Design a protein around this ligand. Structure first.
Ligand SMILES: Nc1ncnc2c1ncn2[C@@H]1O[C@H](COP(=O)(O)OP(=O)(O)OP(=O)(O)O)[C@@H](O)[C@H]1O
Lengths: 836, 701, 158
């Protein structure tokens, strides 16, 4: 029964019984110490990293042995714990031990009743102290003096002194033996505290133990880190060598053996002082709680709020989990407890100051923003790691600008550009693994209760990581210089809007050297800005004025212009995501929405990067506000996470790779109609690009969005369709029949997906004119697919005649793009035809 | 419900009851300090915004604690704040604390009324004080002498120490206990100032807290930068390693674990010295109130005008919002709101001070030039940022010539040549993030009430960065050399006229080659000084004499001839705008009309950039001299902003790229008079150039 | 009393015997802060001198450290440590980029020599330069306020 009180001081001095994390060790260490006395050096070691709780543990051992003095048949007297770091700089350890031993003996002398034995033993104790007084200079002398020899030959010490040389080891051995007679104990326990604060002072502790504490009347327990003692010992064996030999024998044939010889000296020195059978390792909290399936060694519990009793306590694994499940917006699974496992492996001092700063500011706030409460805790707890990792430290800049910059630098050092934007604590480093949960608390807080900020992380945070990996890295020191240009060009950390970043991202996807000159880049199509002869079919120069309301505006945002050697209009999907992020930031006023649609298309002058060598419009704003007001009523309950944002982008980014090359060659002369799946004209490339993002937000958010506790995608294969809609349609169909079984809505379960499928801008891209496949089975799946979207959205997108006109090859459309399919993509010479 | 009186008779250079704003946290901080006494090492770390009132806050912290003694259930006595940098180089902190603890005890001892209590406590203090004196050699000794062992064995002490040795930790612990009894308090607060300006002196502070100040009757409040405290702790951990081990093990396999151990040592050193739950963050103004839509954490009001009552007081966000919009000429939207949030992140003393300078001078000014008014108020509080940014800090040089240099160097330092002329505070460094508002106020003042000075920044101040962004790519310290010589050619520091900046601007754009060498570039077309033989249609050469009044002088103003290895003739919209600046700046006298009118018909050659490898007019004169009569009354109305000037050119610059692209790509032989959009000529392009300028002015205004 | 405390300025080590003389309050001047404070002693010394001289403030003037700019560290340290009173006005001359070079060298001396040699990687070295540049730009800001700095003009500017 270990009940940790988080609102208690929780300090080594204030730690008592029933809240000692190490209790099995304390019970078994005392028995081992006692048995070694019941039957040379008797030295025990307690090992553990910094903050493992060595000082807390070893004080309990002294307390355990001190209690019941006379009752135990074997008698051990414990001196007060010696802390080498807090001792005077130049005093010997033998002086410290004797000074504490003298007081223990002195207080026992003043406790006697008979005036004879007190008088007899007082002079014996004073006689040994005088002998030690005479010989202490042997420790603190810089040289020998001839008159010390006459002191060495003085054999009138009146004691045994089996060897006569003024041996400080023998003087202390008799002094300890006399001290045991007065104190009436079998042995005296010398206790040494850990040297982690300053391990330079630990050499005198190690030297004193082997030189002076060899008596059978002495038992020694020392705490510290063996890898910290090793560098201390190994650093002294290098001082035994003659320096002149070090430079002269600098050859790798002798330097290897010299490094080998020091290893043997260090290995035996550690074995000489601390026998392996006497060592004890301080178990980490994870090693004491085990895992979920396997019961841990102990069942530890913690108290999260003041004023409760011990029955209201919960296990530490759960308490850290709740701070991870809520503070990071993660559901129960293999990625939530894995964050708890990384925190359990942390030092106890570091873990306590997370479990304290969290709940202290949580009980004083609830009497919220749990992700913000955890973020504050992990900012100071991991603060030293943050400085080492070169992240942003200013708390008055904890916003979207800093977070998107941290992600790029975190993966710049994590060496993981593929999946490193999940901020998973899986790195081999300790600092980057510490910042993996601090940066994850950044995402789960800066995106809580929002959709514009969530998409900003998805597009700018995770996006800039991926675009660098596959389009800029091939040119790379250069790598440091390249990042100095990529970040500066893409303005990572200082973006104005997501579309402004998109207007630069779309260039970068085209700036990289791509073969075959085809304009079907990754996530974008390069629509021809001009025309010439030999244009087959209804293929012409792209026109913007051809589209109607909600079709011009939807594509006005989607268009991007790069100011290369020749200006190149680019239509993409990041621009649609960039525009939605900008629009979702706009409030209910209609006087600012028109700025969002128009700031993205005009005044766009994106120069090539240095590393590159070369009124229907009002009828849409009323729909936008009907959706913008729908955003602000549901986005409050949105609980995104670093894993979810990265995972959504992972599924999203893989599709854009598929669509880039699966549709690159599929452009033929008769591709304008798009009746068959073989034809993949520009109106089908971007139809699936938008359907890629909606599917990425469909499955990934159905796996990890913390609002839902039951899986809705179900068992199956998730293939993120390209050139098909069937598997996209079925998953929406499966969720519909599953939500109905639980009588649960389409809004609380998928707040993230619902507000994007209902976005007015994305609607004219779901069903274009050069889009929908027109085979017998294609219309069969798409008839329900269009119906399913209308059902979940809540209103019809296309009327009865609108769907019939698209399936069967004029009536203008206010919600469907028309001229996109007629446009031709740069480098796509339609010199062939679609095979039958 | 904090009310800030900007016109209060009290000087803002002192701290009083709720004179500052952090007192909402200060009460909890005081409570938290008292919270740890009901039950150890209670060390509170105080930080805040970079360069905030670190010294000011802690002085107020101890001021609010020494005042309330009996009305507070738990009594805490505060030592005078210790500045470790202003201390003797070798005096220990334990000596400094005791020397200030002794005076507080001595003053209380002199305040006693009963001799029975005074005598027994005074001798108890001095006996405790003499014990500390006998042990101070341990701190300073460089060698252990055998005579100290007898002192370490002196157990003839009525103080009843716990451990036998001569431990200074418990000698000082018992000394503090006696001091608490004399002063009648439960704890004593030791405060340290920042260790900046000498950060090697903070090690004694850290060691004293670790070893001696770890009692339950002592509260330590430290101030400084943890990034700098980490820097200090890291260095000391390396010195624990033997110099031979460092020299004999330099391989990266060992050098990495060596650094992976020290970083673990400093990680647990701060977590032990400064617990995370005790670290205090000095909130900025933005955190105290929040956002416009988000519910206010604590309503805070500022007295805009003297004599205004608390009911009529307005929120701080609108207090600076009204001030910034009036001074920066910005509407109530999001462009000015991001400047409001920028000023809300400033130190809480600086925000109240900049408000005072603007409002107090406004009251005197009214009893206007508000953009001038805000510049002087911002200059007083931002002068540190301008000086370290290399900008114009000369208080009498805040004119037009220096403004062009400031915009150029701001963009260069901020490293954004495509959007840095918007002067938004989007930078990361504090100096550049704070120089935007000052420069925005400079632009919002120099152009307010005038027309020629609107174009003198759009064409020169803001137009110098878009040309460079069209220039750096074709060429790429050499970059540092490029910007220095770029200013010299444009004469950005000293522009004698805007018609001369555009005269040298055409020679820069024309240097860059085009596709097929059409002779069309940004916002201009390259004319031919010599005719081309056998041109289909009527594509002859150009002679100015053919044109008529208002069609010859206007063309001559747009005309520009650049001397190079090949003589070239140019016409540009930029040259046309330069003529407007000279006429607008010139007076209304008819004799003064000609000097600008003749200058735009000077027909003077322009030197190629060094980096390159190379009365008939009375009809126009009356119109221009009458238009400027209409100019004078219009100039009063226009209130330009830095945002407006950049936005107008942004659309203007971008459109000329399209105009030069949608017209050069149509090769033609008989398209002199364009009946369809698929036809173009030399004059038809210049139609769309001025339309690009006029449309951009129309939409953005 | 100023002579009694001058040893602190020149001492190469702390003498534990001076602690007995750092505890006496026998002075009738009643210095507010406990212990002998050279900054405090000079304050009432200047305050006393203002009454004798019958003046509101005393102007301390320093020449420029040109022939030997190492000697200016004591000037900089004495200004902030001692010459901070309402009765004292300080005017200093010299190249500002020479004082900055002098302060920069001192900020590097607060770094342990072992740390400088053992951490030569660019990520740590660059951060050290940013800290030193920030440390010495604030040192000049506190010592020499910008609103009080005056720049001598040359003929080209005259
Ligand atoms: N049994 C325990 N119960 C509660 N909290 C504990 C326990 N053991 C350790 N802790 C927490 O972990 C921290 C670790 O400090 P501790 O002094 O015990 O470890 P150490 O680093 O080995 O010692 P030192 O402070 O001498 O370097 C404690 O301050 C406390 O917050």
């Amino acid at each position: 029964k270990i009940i940790i009180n988080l609102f208690a001081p929780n300090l080594p001095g204030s730690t008592k019984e029933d809240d000692l994390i190490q209790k099995s060790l304390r019970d078994q260490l005392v028995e081992s110490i006692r048995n070694s006395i019941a039957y040379g050096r008797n030295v025990f070691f307690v090992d553990g990293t910094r903050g493992a709780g060595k000082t807390t543990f070893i004080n309990s051992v002294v307390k355990s042995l001190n209690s019941d003095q006379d009752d135990v048949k074997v008698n051990i007297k414990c001196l007060p714990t010696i802390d080498p770091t807090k001792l005077p700089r130049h005093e010997p350890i033998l002086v410290t031990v004797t000074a504490r031993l003298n007081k223990m003996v002195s207080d026992k002398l003043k406790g006697y009743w008979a005036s004879n034995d007190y008088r007899k033993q007082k002079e014996q104790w004073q006689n040994h102290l005088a002998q030690l007084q005479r010989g202490l200079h042997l420790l603190t002398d810089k040289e020998y003096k001839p008159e010390y020899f006459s002191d060495a030959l003085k054999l009138d010490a009146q004691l045994d002194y089996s060897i006569g040389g003024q041996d400080l080891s023998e003087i202390f051995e008799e002094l300890v033996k006399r001290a045991c007679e007065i104190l009436d104990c079998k042995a005296i326990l010398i206790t040494f505290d850990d040297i982690d604060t300053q391990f330079d002072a630990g050499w005198d502790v190690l030297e004193s133990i082997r030189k002076f504490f060899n008596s059978r009347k002495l038992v020694v327990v020392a705490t510290g880190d063996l890898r910290l003692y090793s560098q201390l010992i190994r650093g002294k064996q290098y001082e035994n060598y003659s320096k002149t030999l070090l430079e002269q024998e600098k050859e790798s044939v002798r330097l290897a053996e010299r490094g080998y010889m020091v290893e043997h000296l260090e290995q035996q020195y550690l074995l000489k002082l601390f026998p392996v059978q006497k060592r004890i390792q301080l178990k980490t909290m994870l090693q004491l709680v085990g895992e979920k399936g396997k019961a841990g060694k102990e069942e530890i519990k913690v108290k999260t709020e003041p004023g409760m009793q011990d029955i209201d306590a919960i296990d530490v694994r759960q308490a850290i989990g709740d701070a991870v499940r809520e503070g990071l917006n993660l559901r129960e699974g293999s990625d939530a407890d894995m964050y708890v496992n990384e925190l359990l492996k942390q030092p106890v001092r570091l873990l306590m100051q997370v479990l304290q700063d969290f709940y202290t500011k949580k009980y004083h706030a609830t009497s919220l923003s749990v992700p913000n409460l955890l973020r504050n805790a992990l900012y100071g707890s991991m603060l030293s790691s943050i400085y080492r990792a070169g992240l942003n430290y200013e708390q008055h800049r904890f916003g979207m600008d800093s977070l998107c910059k941290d992600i790029f630098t975190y993966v710049k050092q994590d060496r993981d550009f593929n999946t490193g934007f999940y901020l998973r604590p899986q790195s081999e480093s300790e600092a980057l693994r510490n910042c993996s949960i601090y940066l994850a608390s950044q995402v789960s807080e800066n995106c809580q209760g929002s959709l514009s900020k969530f998409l900003q992380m998805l597009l700018v945070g995770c996006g800039s990581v991926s675009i660098f990996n596959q389009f800029v890295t091939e040119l790379a020191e250069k790598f440091e210089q390249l990042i100095s240009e990529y970040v500066a060009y893409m303005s990572v950390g200082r973006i104005e809007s997501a579309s402004h970043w998109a207007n630069r991202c779309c260039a970068v996807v085209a700036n990289s050297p791509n073969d075959e000159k085809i304009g079907v880049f990754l996530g974008m199509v390069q629509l021809n800005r001009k025309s010439r002869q030999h244009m087959p079919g209804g293929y012409k120069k792209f026109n913007i004025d051809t589209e109607n309301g909600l079709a011009k505006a939807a594509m006005a945002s989607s268009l991007s212009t790069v100011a290369s050697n020749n200006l190149m209009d680019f239509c993409s999907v990041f621009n649609l995501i960039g525009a939605i992020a900008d629009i979702s930031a706009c409030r209910c006023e209609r006087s600012a929405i028109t700025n969002a649609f128009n700031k993205v298309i005009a005044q766009t002058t994106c120069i090539v990067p240095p590393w590159s060598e070369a009124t229907e419009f009002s009828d849409a704003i009323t729909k936008v506000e009907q959706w913008l007001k729908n955003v602000n009523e549901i986005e409050i309950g949105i609980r995104p996470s670093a894993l979810l944002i990265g995972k959504v982008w992972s599924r999203f980014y893989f599709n854009l790779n598929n669509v880039a090359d699966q549709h690159k060659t599929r452009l033929y002369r008769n591709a304008e109609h798009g009746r068959m799946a073989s034809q993949s004209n520009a109106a089908k490339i971007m139809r699936f690009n938008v359907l890629a993002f909606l599917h990425a937000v469909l499955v990934e958010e159905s796996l990890y969005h913390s609002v839902s506790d039951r899986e809705y995608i179900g068992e199956g294969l998730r293939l993120n369709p390209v050139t098909s809609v069937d598997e996209f349609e079925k998953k929406i169909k499966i969720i519909g029949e599953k939500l109905k079984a639980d009588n649960k809505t389409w809004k609380n379960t998928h707040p993230l997906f619902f507000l994007l499928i209902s976005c007015p801008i994305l609607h004219p891209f779901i069903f274009p004119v050069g889009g929908i496949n027109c085979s017998v089975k294609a219309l069969n799946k798409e008839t329900s697919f269009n119906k399913l979207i209308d059902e979940i959205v809540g209103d019809k997108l296309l009327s009865d005649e609108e769907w019939d006109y698209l399936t069967k090859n004029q009536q203008i459309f206010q919600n469907t793009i028309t001229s996109l399919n007629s446009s031709t993509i740069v480098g796509a010479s339609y010199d062939k035809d679609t095979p039958a």
